Amino acid sequence: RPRFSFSIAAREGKARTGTIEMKRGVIRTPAFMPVGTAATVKALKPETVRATGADIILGNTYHLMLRPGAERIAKLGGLHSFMGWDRPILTDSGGYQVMSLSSLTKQSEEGVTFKSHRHMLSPERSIEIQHLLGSDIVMAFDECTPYPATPSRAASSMERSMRWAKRSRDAFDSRKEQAENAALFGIQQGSVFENLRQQSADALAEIGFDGYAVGGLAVGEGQDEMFRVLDFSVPMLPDDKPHYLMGVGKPDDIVGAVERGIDMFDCVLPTRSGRNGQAFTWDGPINIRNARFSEDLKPLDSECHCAVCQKWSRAYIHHLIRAGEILGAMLMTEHNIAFYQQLMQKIRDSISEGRFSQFAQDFRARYFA
Amino acid sequence: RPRFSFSIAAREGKARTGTIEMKRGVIRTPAFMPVGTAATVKALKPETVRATGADIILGNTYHLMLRPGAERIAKLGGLHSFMGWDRPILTDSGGYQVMSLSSLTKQSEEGVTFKSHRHMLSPERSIEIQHLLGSDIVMAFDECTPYPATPSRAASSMERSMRWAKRSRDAFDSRKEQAENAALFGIQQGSVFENLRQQSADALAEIGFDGYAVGGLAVGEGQDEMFRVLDFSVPMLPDDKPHYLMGVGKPDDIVGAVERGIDMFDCVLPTRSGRNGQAFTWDGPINIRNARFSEDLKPLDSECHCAVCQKWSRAYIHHLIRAGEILGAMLMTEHNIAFYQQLMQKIRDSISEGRFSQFAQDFRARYFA
Ligand SMILES: [Cl-]
Ligand SMILES: [Cl-]
Ligand SMILES: [Zn+2]
Ligand SMILES: [Zn+2]
C-alpha cells in the first residue's frame, strides 16, 4: 500500500472527487473527518464510526499531549491501537487549539509556551508528538490569525507560520519512519487578504507538501466572507494535491466549499450538536427535544440509511435526550455522523456523474425550504 | 410459544437451573436482568444488551408513568417497540420506587398518592400501566416495608401488601389480553420475621401466581441478615415456580442467593458502578480511574469474553473515564453487564453439571483474595 497517493477521478468546475491511498486505508474525497479530540469520537465506538462511512478521523496534538500524554500513547502502542481505530488519522498540530484553549500563552519565534489549566509547542515538538501518536496525516505547526486582523498583523502572523511550515517540513523529513509512513500537510494563512494568501500559498508550494490546508477560516467571519476568501485562495494551491478546509462545517458550508475546490473537512458540529439535541436532516436541522417530536414515530430523517433511522423513532430519541440518557447522545451522534457521510457520498457520486451543480441546487432548495 | 412455562432442568441442594419460556423468548435461570428504568439500559443499545447474554431486562412502572407516560408509550406501540428490545421485559410495579423517589406521598388502603418533583398508584392502576407498557412479567403492586421495622408495623405493612396482591391478581385477570400474553408475579413481604414471611407466602400461594418475588430485602440489612431471611423465606414459596430476589445484587450476593433457591435477579450495580469507574473482575472489583491503570495494557478482566475485553485496554478505559467521555461509560457498562451474564452462565452450567458447590467456593476464594 502506498504511503500517500492522491488521484482525481472526476471534476466538475472547481469540484473534484477521487481517492487518497495510504498505508492504513483509502480516503474517498471529498471527505468528512469526524473529530476525535480526546482519542474518541464522542459517544461512538470506532466500529460505529466506520459503519457510518468514515474513512479517516481527526485527532489533536494539543489535547493528547496533555491527556494522556504523547510518550504515554507511544508506550501503549500508538494512538490507533490505544483507541481501536486502525484506519488513517489526521492530527491537527496544536497551532490553533493552544491559543483557543490555554489559560495563559507566550508566543515567540520558537513556538508557544502555555499553561493548560506548563508546556511548550514548537514546530519540532508538534511533529515529534504527532510521530509519537503515529498520525497518518501530520499537520504543520502554524498560527491561526485572529479575525479580524489588520493587514500588517495578518502578514506578520502568516510569515511566522510560513517559517514554522519549513521547520515542520524539516522535522518531519528528519524522522525516517515518519517520512516513510506518514504524510505532511502545510497550512495556508493570510486572513482574508488575497495578496497574503498568495504569498502563503507560494511559500508552501516552494517547500512542498503532500496536501494543503486552508487555515485561518471558520474563525467568526461568516459564510459569505469564507466563500469569498475560498474563491481566490483555493486556486492558489497546487491543483494535484488535496485541499483541506480546517474546521468546516455546516452541511451548506461543505457543499459550497466543494464547489470551490475543497477535498477534506472536519467539524465538531455533528457530534457536539448531536449531544445537544440537534439532528441533521435533508429538510434542515431539527431540535429533537422540541415537544412536537414527543409522539412522532418517524425516524430522524425520512431517507437516511443509518442504523438509528432503521430502528428508533424521533419520539424515543426525544425522550432519551430530555431524560439526559447516554443512549440519546449515542443515537443522535451516530445519525448525525452518518448524515454527514451520506452528504459526502452524494457529493462524490454527483461529481463523478457530472451532476454536482444540480445536486447542490436541489440540496439547498430542500435543506432551506 | 407458551405464555409462561417454567422448567427446572437440574438441582444442587436448594439451587436450581432451568428455563422460563415466554412468547417473546426464553429466559435461562438463574437469570440476571439488566435494569432499564427510563426505557433504556443506560449507555447500551438493546443489541449490545443482548450480545452480553441478557434474556430479559427490567423496567419500572413508576418512572415510565411519569416520563414519557404509559398511555403515550402504548400509543407509540408499547415499550418493546419504543425502546427496540423485542425480548421479555419484567416491570416492577411502582410499589417501592413510589416511596423511595417521591417528594411527597400519601399512603392509604386504596394506594399511594404522590408528587413527582400529582399522581396515584394503586394495584389496579399499576396493573393497567404495566398493560399499557406491554410488560411480559407484571409485578403485583406492593409496599416495601422500611428496615428496620417493628414486628407489628411489618405485619400491618405485609397484610396490606397481601390485600394489594389479590387486587393485582384480579386486575390482571380482568384484562384478557394481559392474562393471555403476560405473567404475574406476587411479592412476599414480612421484613426479617419468619412468621410474617410464612403468612405472606401462604397468602400469595392461596391467590396463585406465575412466580414469587422475595421483596423487602436489599433495604440496608446487610448480607448476613439477607441470607438469614432467605434461608427460611425461599423454602416457603412454591418450589415449582420461579423465585425472584428484587434488587440483588453484588456478585457474591447473587451466588449466595442462588445457593438459597433464587432464580432471578436485578440490580443497578453493573450499570451504575460501570459509569462511576468500577469494573467487576473475577479477582474482585477494580476502580479503573486509579493511577495504577494508566499504562496497563491488559483488558478489564483477564478471562472475560466480552467485546470490550477483546479490544481495549485498562489504560484506554482509564483515560476515557477520567476525561468524562461517554465511550468510557459505554465500555465499562458493557463489560460489567457481560461479567454479570458470564457469572450467571457459570452458575447455570455448574448447577447443571452438579458442581455448583465447588464453583461457589472457587469463586469466593478468588474474588475475595
Ligand atoms: Cl464533539
Ligand atoms: Cl443504572
Ligand atoms: Zn439516520
Ligand atoms: Zn469484559
Swiss-Prot record, chains A, B:
| InterPro entries assigned to the protein according to its UniProt record, in alphabetical order | ArchSynthase1/Queuine_TRR, TGT, TGT-like_sf, tRNA_ribo_trans-like
What's an example GO cellular component term for this entry?
cytosol
Enumerate the residue ranges of region (RNA binding). Answer: 247-253, 271-275
Q: Which UniProt keywords apply?
A: Glycosyltransferase, Metal-binding, Queuosine biosynthesis, Transferase, tRNA processing, Zinc
Residue positions annotated to bind substrate are: 92-96, 142, 189, 216
* Keyword Glycosyltransferase annotated: yes
Catalytic residues as annotated in Swiss-Prot or TrEMBL: 92 (proton acceptor), 266 (nucleophile)
Where along this sequence does the record place binding of Zn(2+)? 304, 306, 309, 335
Q: Which cofactor does it need?
A: Zn(2+)
Q: Which GO terms describe its biological process?
A: queuosine biosynthetic process; tRNA wobble guanine modification; tRNA-guanine transglycosylation
Protein family according to the UniProt entry? Belongs to the queuine tRNA-ribosyltransferase family.
Assembly behavior: Homodimer. Within each dimer, one monomer is responsible for RNA recognition and catalysis, while the other monomer binds to the replacement base PreQ1.
The name on file for this protein is Queuine tRNA-ribosyltransferase
Source organism per UniProt:
Zymomonas mobilis subsp. mobilis (strain ATCC 31821 / ZM4 / CP4)
Tell me what gene encodes this: tgt
